[PDB]
Amino acid sequence: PQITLWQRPLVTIKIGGQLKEALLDTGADDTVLEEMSLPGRWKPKMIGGIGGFIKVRQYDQILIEICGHKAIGTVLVGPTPVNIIGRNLLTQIGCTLNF
Amino acid sequence: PQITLWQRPLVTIKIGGQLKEALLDTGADDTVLEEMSLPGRWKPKMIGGIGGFIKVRQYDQILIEICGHKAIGTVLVGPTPVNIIGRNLLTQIGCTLNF
Numbered sequence: 343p344q345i346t347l348w349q350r351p352l353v354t355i356k357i358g359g360q361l362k363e364a365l366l367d368t369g370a371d372d373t374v375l376e377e378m379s380l381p382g383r384w385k386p387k388m389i390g391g392i393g394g395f396i397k398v399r400q401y402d403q404i405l406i407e408i409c410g411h412k413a414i415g416t417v418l419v420g421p422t423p424v425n426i427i428g429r430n431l432l433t434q435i436g437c438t439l440n441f
Numbered sequence: 442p443q444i445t446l447w448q449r450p451l452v453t454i455k456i457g458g459q460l461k462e463a464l465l466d467t468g469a470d471d472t473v474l475e476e477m478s479l480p481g482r483w484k485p486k487m488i489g490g491i492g493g494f495i496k497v498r499q500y501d502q503i504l505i506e507i508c509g510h511k512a513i514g515t516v517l518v519g520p521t522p523v524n525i526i527g528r529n530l531l532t533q534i535g536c537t538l539n540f
């Protein structure tokens with residue numbers, strides 16, 4: 343579809359059988375989500391934001407559906423203010439900027 | 442124009458007669474710039490994100506040139522790690538997100 347930016351670009355995602363809400367963020371390289379349980383083993387990571395660094399748990403090859411589109415890649419879990427969909431997954435669904 | 446997201450979406454902007462490079466961010470409500478001097482009165486504020494809150498100085502009605510287009514709007518000045526162009530200026534040059 344086409345999304346204008348007069349209000350926050352929020353979308354529904356289906357992950358692990360449940361529906362959740364997330365923000366489409368072109369400035370982020372990675373996808374970051376709130377504290378939840380995921381299958382498999384994990385590895386550690388530090389990412390910096392506008393207010394400092396945070397430690398996160400990294401999970402690879404997770405399936406996640408965004409507005410009917412399917413993607414499979416890395417997802418990070420940690421203390422974030424909202425769920426974030428970043429460039430790593432925006433490229434899989436073929437999303438672009440237009441002005 | 443159409444921009445892909447295989448790499449970071451960086452652009453050059455002109456403010457206060459100074460050249461700067463910035464990141465197009467659909468997730469940010471406002472525009473936040475690194476510590477610099479601007480003319481006028483300003484009000485202190487707190488904005489939060491990944492990692493916590495930061496204190497900034499808010500200036501209103503600042504003119505900015507972004508990739509050939511003029512725009513007017515609020516600008517927040519403070520210790521952000523990188524220059525960010527948010528939704529309040531992006532809407533003014535009619536940028537949309539498409540997939």
Ligand SMILES: O=c1oc2c(c(O)c1[C@H](c1cccc(NS(=O)(=O)c3ccccc3)c1)C1CC1)CCCCCC2
Nearest residue numbers: 367369370390391392466468469470471488489490491
């Ligand atoms: O915190 C972040 O860290 C980074 C990026 C990013 O897009 C954010 C976001 C952000 C940005 C600007 C202002 C606000 N604060 S706000 O008031 O505009 C806001 C508050 C809550 C929710 C959304 C927006 C929040 C966070 C919401 C996700 C990516 C770009 C590069 C910078 C470093 C990483």
